[PDB]
Amino acid sequence: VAYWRQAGLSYIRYSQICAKAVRDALKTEFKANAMKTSGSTIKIVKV
């Protein structure tokens, strides 16, 4: 129960929002790497 853990929120999620914020942070240069990491082209095959 952190604002997020009491938002339920995954620590992953939390974390990822952090990471997302890292990407948000940084500098242009290093923003390249943002996209390098991140994301998912995956699809939840719900079955």
Partner: protein
Amino acid sequence: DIKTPELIIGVSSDRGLCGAIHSSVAKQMKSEAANLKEVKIIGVGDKIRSILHRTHSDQFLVTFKEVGRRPPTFGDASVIALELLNSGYEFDEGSIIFNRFRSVISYKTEEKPIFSLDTISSAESMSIYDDIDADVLRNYQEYSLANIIYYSLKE
């Protein structure tokens, strides 16, 4: 060490036209699958969905699409990890089946077990491998699931 009397999941690529990666996992998930209670399976990649589908049309929990053809990332790892959590399937003792690369001459479809329970980790001597909360535990249990996921994915 962790245990349970009880997330069997395998890791494959989205596509074939590569080795017997698929075959392995396909095999070895099923190879398991009889043994355990809470039989439920998760497939990351689909060259496992495409072979482990026969009746895994019924025993998958979710399945994940794209893997390769887009290089894996932590980012991603988190994604698949995340929703994975939300689901009442956790450990039947989870296991993760992936292709451990070793060399271009060899990989071994490897597997590890995923203790998807904090709880027995709460139990055991694991009790004092931490000496600090079934909270953060979970948020590591979490994190390590992503880390491994990433890892696995990449291997």
